[PDB]
Design a protein around this nucleic acid. Sequence first.
RNA 1: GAGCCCCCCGCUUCUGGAAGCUAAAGGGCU
Lengths: 350, 385
Amino acid sequence: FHDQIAMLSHRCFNTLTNSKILAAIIMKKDSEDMGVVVSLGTGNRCVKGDSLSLKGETVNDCHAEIISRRGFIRFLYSELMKYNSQTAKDSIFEPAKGGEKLQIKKTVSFHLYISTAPCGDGALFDKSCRHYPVFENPKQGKLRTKVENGEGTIPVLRTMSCSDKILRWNVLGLQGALLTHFLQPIYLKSVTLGYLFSQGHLTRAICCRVTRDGSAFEDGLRHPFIVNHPKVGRVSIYDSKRQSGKTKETSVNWCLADGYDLEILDGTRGTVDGPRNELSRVSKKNIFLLFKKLCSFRYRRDLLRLSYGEAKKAARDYETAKNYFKKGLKDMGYGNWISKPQEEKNFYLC
Amino acid sequence: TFHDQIAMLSHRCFNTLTNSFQPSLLGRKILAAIIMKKDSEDMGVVVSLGTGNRCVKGDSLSLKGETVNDCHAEIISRRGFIRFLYSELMKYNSQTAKDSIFEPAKGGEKLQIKKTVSFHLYISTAPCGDGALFDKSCSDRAMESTESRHYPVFENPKQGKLRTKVENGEGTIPVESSDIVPTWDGIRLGERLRTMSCSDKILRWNVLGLQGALLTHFLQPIYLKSVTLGYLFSQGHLTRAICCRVTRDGSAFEDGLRHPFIVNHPKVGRVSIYDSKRQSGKTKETSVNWCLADGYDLEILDGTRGTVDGPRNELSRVSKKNIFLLFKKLCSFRYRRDLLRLSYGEAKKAARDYETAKNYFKKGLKDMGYGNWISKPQEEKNFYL
RNA sequence: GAGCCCCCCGCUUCUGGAAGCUAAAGGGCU
Ligand SMILES: O=P(O)(O)O[C@H]1[C@H](OP(=O)(O)O)[C@H](OP(=O)(O)O)[C@H](OP(=O)(O)O)[C@@H](OP(=O)(O)O)[C@H]1OP(=O)(O)O
Ligand SMILES: O=P(O)(O)O[C@H]1[C@H](OP(=O)(O)O)[C@H](OP(=O)(O)O)[C@H](OP(=O)(O)O)[C@@H](OP(=O)(O)O)[C@H]1OP(=O)(O)O
Ligand SMILES: [Zn+2]
Ligand SMILES: [Zn+2]
Ligand SMILES: [Zn+2]
Ligand SMILES: [Zn+2]
C-alpha cells in the first residue's frame, strides 16, 4: 500500500520538475481509486533569529513536512472556494452536525509520505532496536527543538521538531486554527516513511507518546478532537548506502490548485529565490488573505474585523484543545512547548 | 630513551602476539605502543598495543556506548593503557604498596605515579593532522641531541589549525566555518561525521593526561615522556603538533592551567632508518588491541563499524560500556559509594578539576585562533546504563 | 586578484586492474 503512495509522490515530483528530501500529502477518494498527490514539498533548512519577521512575510520552517502541510492548507482553501450548492455532490465536503460547519466526507481520506524520518523523536534508535510504542528509557519521548545549521534537534526563537509538530497534527488536526471556523479537524489516515523507519519510536513519537500512562488524556479531550493513531508503514525496498551528498537549501512547494507553477524558497531566510525577494505564497500574509476572502465569500463579516491573532483566538474550541494538549504534554514530563510572542501574529492585512 | 629500542620492543611484542594467528594480519597496518620504564636499567616492557587506520560511520553510532568511535592505532593504544591502569589499581593494596607503580600523594585522597616510573609512546607513522603536512622527502636525519628544548616552526597561519577525519572523505580537513552542529538525529539523517585527528588528541593528552576523566578521581594526571616515530618525522612540525602549538603566543596559557594539570613536552625522536616499504594503497580496516593484563589475548575489531570483527558483533573490551563497568567495580572496591550511583556523563562531570581544565584548554585553543573542538552529540556521550 | 592542470592522501561502480567522487596541503602556466 505504501509503495503506491511513494511512487505517486515521486512521479508527481519528477513530472513537475522535468521542465532528495521530499514530503507529500495524498488524497484517496476511494479504496479502488489510486489517489492523487495534493500537496508537495521539499527542503531541510530552518530560518534563524535574524530572518524572523514580525509581520510574517517569511516561512519560519522550510522543512519538507511543514511545507507540505502549508500547501495542503492552501489546497483546502481552494476547495472551500469551489464549494457551492450545485457542486455539493461532486465535492469532498458535507454538512456536519448542527449545520454550522462543513466536514470532510467519510470516503475521502488523506495520507502523508516523507522520504526520511522526521527530526526529533523519530530517529532516536540504533541497529539494536495495533500500535506498539517503545518506552524503554526515561529520556525517550521528550520534546526537541530544531538547531540552527543542521537537520538535527536538541532536547529542551526556537522551533519544535518535525515529530512534535506531527504529534500536534495528530491531536489537533491538520487544518489549523483558521479553517476550524469552517471545518471539523482532519487527521491523517496513514504515515509512510522512506528512510529511517522504526515502528516503536515512530508510533511513540507521533501518536502514542500521550497514551503512555493510560487513557487519562483522551477523556479530557473535548469533542471532536481525538488522539488519532494513523497507520504507520514503510517502503518495501530501499536504497542501501545512506546518502551523504551535500544538499541545497532550496525549498520547492506546490499545491494541486497551482497547475505547473512551483515556488522556490531558501530555508536560511524563507523567501522566494530572487533578487526582488518576493513574498512566499505559503507565508502568513497569503494565508490570511485567502481566509479573509473565504470569510467575505461566506458572508461572515464578524471574522473580517479580527486580525490574525484575534481570528486565531476566536476559535474557542480549537484553542482550548491546544492548551489542554500542551498542558498534558507538560504534565507527563516532556518540557514546556515554546510559543512565539503574540506580537508576531498581531498584524493587520493592508 | 634510545628510540630504536622502543621500536624493536613494539614490533617484537606484535610479532610474538601474532606469530601464528590467521593470515589476515599480513596486510599493511599502522602500529602504536606504550612502553613503561621502571628505572634506569630497565630494558622496557610493552603495556599497550593498538592498530587500525579507520573510524566509524555516522550510521553505526550507538546510544548506549557499545561502539568505539575511532580505530587509529594511537587511540586504541591509549584505551589499552586505560585498561592497564584500571587493572593495576585493582591490584593495589596496603601490603603491596611498594611493588606497585603507585604511591600516596599529598593527603592520601588520590594516588599518583612513582617518580621512578615513566611512559613512552611509539607510532609507526606520523600522527594524522597537524603532524603530517610535509612530504616524505622532507625527512630530517636522526640526531642524538642531548638538549630537550623543542624547535617549533610556524611557517604559515594555516599550520596550527585543528582538523577532523571526515566520514567517506579523504584527507584531514580543518574545523571550517562549518557551523553544522553535531546532533544524533542529524547525523543519522545523513550529515557528515567528523572525528578529531590523532595529533589533536595527542595534544589533549599532553595538556590533560592519558588517564582520561573518570580515572582522575583516584589518580593525578599521567603524562608521557617520549614519542618515537617510524616514518614521516619532522621535528619542527611534530613538536608544534603535539605540545608547542599551545605556547606560541607566550606562557600566559601555562599559568592559567592549575596544578596537577600542566603542559607536557615529551622528547621527540625518530627511528634510525625507516622501512622503505610503505605501500600507499591496500589499507584494510581490521584493528587489533592488546593490554598487559590480557596476557596473550588480542581483540580484533572491524574499524568501520566499531565492534568486534565477527558475525555476532559482540561488545568490544575497549568500548565505553566496559570502561564504565571497570569504573563501577573499582568504585565498589575503594568504598566510593557516592560515585556508584551516577551515570557516565555525570560521573565524568563529577571530577570538577578535570572538567575545569578541559574546558579551559578548549577555550584557550579557540581564543588563540586554531578553531573549535568538535564534540559528539550529547545523546551519545551521556548514554544509558 | 582571476582562471587552468601536476603530483601524495577515505569511499562507490565494472584476485587484479580501470573509472568517478570526497576537500586539504605545496607547485607550475596565462
Ligand atoms: O508553520 P507551522 O510550523 O506549520 O506552525 C505554525 C506555528 O509554528 P512555527 O512558528 O514553528 O512555524 C505555530 O506555532 P508557534 O511556534 O507560533 O507556537 C502554530 O501554532 P500557533 O500559531 O497557535 O502558535 C501553528 O498554528 P496552528 O495552531 O493554526 O496550526 C502555525 O501557525 P501559522 O500557520 O499561523 O503560521
Ligand atoms: O577517541 P578517544 O581517545 O576514545 O576519546 C574519547 C572521545 O573521543 P571520540 O570523539 O572519538 O568519541 C571523547 O571525545 P569527544 O567525543 O568529546 O570529541 C572524549 O570525551 P570528553 O570530551 O567528554 O572528555 C574522551 O574523553 P576522556 O578525556 O575522558 O578520555 C574520550 O571519551 P571516552 O573515554 O568515553 O571514549
Ligand atoms: Zn525536520
Ligand atoms: Zn499511536
Ligand atoms: Zn591518524
Ligand atoms: Zn614541545
